[PDB]
């Protein structure tokens, strides 16, 4: 027995594929082993995304895995919902409910707002980038209207990095003269590293400057540059480096080689790779459950073409989606459990603030409870 | 000759299709004829959009006309950029550069910011609809950050129609608590009509209030019910009914036997339908120029399917794009001129206010010259 | 044992006929039956009213039910008082005393004056209509003369359906010039609805104003429009919807169909039709009382001619009149009891105010007690 | 050359009948005679009015002359407008356009308001009655609202004569409490006589108190009872006794005995009787016009009854109306010219003021020209 699955990875995602492969070899069951097809492409390109999706659908896959960007989330969700093909992804949650999509990255708007309230902020600057959607920006603006916050939102995606050296100085001087020492960096890791590099270059990390990084990879990026800068630096993390599961996984990970497993000869892993490991775990758990329920979702023939009119759905896909959204498993990113929509629930987000000795967990955040200080 | 094009009209777009037929029957001549294949679909469904798009592509069409939405713009842009097939649309301009896309709606961020500066505002509210995009919201937020404004951004897109009566009342009660006198409505015609109805019901159209309708169709709405309220109302208009071309078009549009041409037997025309008429005009002009240039654009049924692997485009696409972007003609929207990215330049937006004797054009806005008061 | 009665209804008053039939079937048979002749006409045309009255009298009817207007009240009064034929009517009470006429509508002049005194008005406006007489206008003027008020009486009746908007806008502009915020509407349902639409259009339903609907049909109008404006809206109501009889009737009435009972599928009921129902009850009770007294009212022969000279009145008409004015029952309007002149006594008018949550009763008015607050 | 006309007169009208007979003998042309039938009846009884009208129509009359009051005007107007029978009346004009009715009494609201403005009045009192229509009161109130007047309107037509002492004493005490030295008496002859008697009794007829008699007959009342005292007393006059025609008529009028011509041997004639004489003149000359036009209008006892179903008119009656309403003559009232409605157009109202010596003309009022001074 073997279930065919599809894999989508961007051009430059080596650690994610390495983590997927280690997860496959780890939770591979002798009763049934997944046969994954891996397609490398430009995740921003919707044409390439739909090409790969239709190729996988023609191959007759039961659960598609892969990433999506701001420019392909719509087509991915639309094709999955119309064709009843389950999609598992560690990318940003969709801006609203979307069937047949398994969002494994927990929402961070709640944790970010709780951290702002805990720090008791009234006015700050929101440095955002349109790469993970503007849902966090909308949530911040709505909460600012509710709580009477003086938030100044500045976009950094549109400015070309060539000419974006004087505008950084201008807006930083504006913040300094307005005493806007509180900033939030809602950007991808590369953009966050670029922004903090410019911050150190311009010397805008003096005492009083409280930086908040709105991503789950706080330690995954570079923090040794502002370790002793005397600036309040905070962030969030979904993977805990203390529990036994992640400890043993990291041992088995750093004991690997960087030749056949790129991006695996270190101790610090990315939350995307950890969530891909967790996705392998949830996939094998749900397929095992479906097999144990005496349901053979195996399609007799090929699924056909995606474009073929009228749409060609299949109830085995709905069954696979139902099995996917009914799994409760412990993993690297914490407790894994989903709603009927596909979003992730029952999760804990560890909050840490950078100090001179290093980042240290100042507490944890969940959904059933507000921010907790540890 | 006979050149075949495509159509992606939405399901519920009748006036735009009527304007399309009117433009076809007017600009049609003995030189050549335009044979379109019109598909009525859900512009929000990317799967349906893809089906229609490469259905027309397999039909071997030369250019495509239609609409899109924030949930399907990326699919259209990627498909056109990859298959080199042009796409003329009256929908919102794409947030950035996209080749083989001709956008007929002029940008409104610059005109709106100029109008706000002319009115000398410092604390106002911005009611935006997430179902259409947030480019204008991003622009106004950046300007406020660079000009020290107090913008209260409130989303009115998630408001369902089952209880969209108390929601607006509570929203405006909160605005009154915040002492908000000036409001900017960045919504479509139906949404702004609902907001105006709620404003009138809760009696918030009295003297001392200001409203700015952030859309090109100022006179498209039922603006008569708020005309006698006594509150400042400002907006933008793209079609000048006092122009000879617009008057001559209306002279035939008002007597079009509405049963045959839906939404025609009236003196007002929505800016989307006006841009559809202008799109027919510009397509005819571009094809006439291309043929009169001694260029062979013969194409047979060799297009294949949109998901061909590898996807080889046709060489006539770039020449059609160049011919389409080199058109300088006059229409209902005014002067029509495109840049190297497909966006419109050398255009004029008429800023209007609402008075007790009807709307009046106080001035005009341009991209080379800022707001001008007459 | 069939008792012959008559019926006059206007061309457009169908809910009143529906309520008449509902009462006719509610008290169908106790010890006899009632046989009505229904005649529809223009109630404001005295010739048609006389023709119908003469035809019904020639048909040998015992009592007559029907409406009248300011230009047809005198004819009905004179014919009834000379031919000794009773006339039960829900129309406006006659400006004086008149025999053989039963006026079901309670007087509103006392309640209106008491409400004005309770609100402590000194300067206000009085929008009257030349539709139901100017008796209330004369009473208000006399009271103002005796209490040192400043009444601005304006007629809103002599306007056509071609410049109503302009006329009302000019009237309220003059009202603003005089700085009058307190307004009284002596109009009926349609006229007050038009005035409400116009005042909403000009934006004068906001806080700082006060309107009194001087008619018993407070909730019968469309008060949903001004319920959220923030201005006081008072009124009067004769049917008490949270009663026992009223609730039972509304349950039995909202279940009917508009196909067979026009205007009889709603949770509300106009006071005219309610008084029609109570008139049916009153006539049935009066004839049951006459049967209990064992008096033969059967005519010796044909009634004769309506315009007979000399006019000889049948003596049994006086007994019919006494039975009509002697009955005392409880219905929708409340305690129904008449005096020697046919007017209503021992009645109660429920004063209502239009709050945001809805029209809430604030007290009741009687003839032996002044306005009582609860 | 033999025409039947109908006559309606109140039970107690003598001078009007005498003037009717005077006009009949004075215009008894040898070409044709107008044989009248006189019906004496209580004009305030709509049934009696209808009976007489139906009898006259049944015998086939061509025109009807008579009077009415506020309780019998609608019956006459409706019956005339339905059966197409002309009706000449010196009574008060109807408050609108009523066909087939000739109103020889000129309106007085315009002259009254012109006199008020010429006397420079801002606050005064207006004592009226409900026995001659409320059109003058409505006009006074509308003009007061337009010109910022303070008018005290008090109705004195609802009181009896035994309680008149106390009622009028309280009324004049209230007038003194407002210091009302300027009053307008829009009442009938008996009412104004009682008013002036009570004024003399209280002693308020001293200089300073200004009285205006709002009727055309300022010689019929006790013009000498209140003449002494120096009090301003004004009034109107439609008859001019200095005119040659009026003097020649009254020269015979005085010589006529009282036996067969009641109320004739006097130097003063009521304006109602003057309008009766003018009515005889106008019907006679209109029938001369009809006879000279070569038109046969022969009617006899064949018109049937008034209550015929369906009520069919008789055609040449509209020709009677056209002859009546499209003519101009000279009479006691002056120039007699009617419009398409039936009201006078080119009347000249004279204005009289009272001193201790007696009445004296002040000026004249016309429809095209305002108050005139001499
Ligand atoms: C950077 O991190 C340090 C870590 O201690 C922060 O120090 C303390 O931060 C808290 C809250 O962030 C401050 O409490 C505040 O006190 C003021 C009264 O001065 C009160 O009005 C506020 O509502 C809030 O409770 C606390 O004062 C501050 N200092 C100490 C010694 O505890 C610091 O605030 C962080 N930010 C910056 C810009 O330094
Ligand atoms: C609705 O539109 C009217 C247009 O008349 C607005 O009136 C504006 O009121 C402001 C008051 O702040 C005026 O500004 C003043 O300008 C003078 C001269 O520069 C300056 O000395 C004052 O200190 C003040 O700044 C403004 O001139 C005036 N508009 C015009 C055209 O004169 C009204 O405010 C608008 N309503 C709302 C709610 O925005
Ligand atoms: C509308 O209603 C309010 C509240 O009842 C009125 O305000 C009151 O006015 C009276 C004078 O008549 C004062 O004595 C009270 O103090 C006021 N407040 C309250 C809470 O009663 C108001 O006058 C009414 N009319 C208008 C035009 O606003
Ligand atoms: C009554 O008549 C007298 C004289 O005809 C009026 O007396 C003067 O009228 C003028 C008119 O504008 C006033 O300016 C004077 O002040 C009046 N003088 C006096 C002593 O009264 C008088 O106004 C008329 N009306 C009344 C009510 O007396
Ligand atoms: C803009 O359009 C107008 C009208 O066609 C034209 O006269 C003008 O030259 C254009 N401007 C430029 C810069 O081409």
Residue numbers in the entry:
A (entry chain A), B (entry chain B), C (entry chain D), D (entry chain C): 10 to 383
Mind quoting what the paper says about this structure?
AMPA glutamate receptors (AMPARs) are ion channel tetramers that mediate the majority of fast excitatory synaptic transmission. They are composed of four subunits (GluA1–GluA4); the GluA2 subunit dominates AMPAR function throughout the forebrain.
We chose pH 8.0 to ensure strict alkaline conditions for our structural studies and note that the GluA2–TARPγ2 kinetics at pH 8.0 matched that at pH 7.4, used in the functional studies above. As already apparent in the two-dimensional (2D) class averages, the signal encompassing the NTD tier was diffuse at low pH but was well defined throughout the receptor at pH 8.0. The two-fold symmetric BD NTD interface is stapled together by cation–π interactions between R172 and F231 on either end that are unique to GluA2 and is stabilized in its center by van der Waals contacts and H-bonds, including those between the H208 side chain and the I203 main chain. Despite its relatively small size (400 Å solvent-accessible surface area), this GluA2-specific NTD interface largely maintains a compact conformation of the receptor in structural snapshots of the gating cycle. Taken together, our data imply a unique regulation of the predominant, GluA2-containing AMPARs. These are endowed with a pH-dependent conformational switch—a compact NTD (at neutral pH) and a ruptured NTD (at acidic pH)—that responds to presynaptic activity and thereby tunes postsynaptic transmission and plasticity.
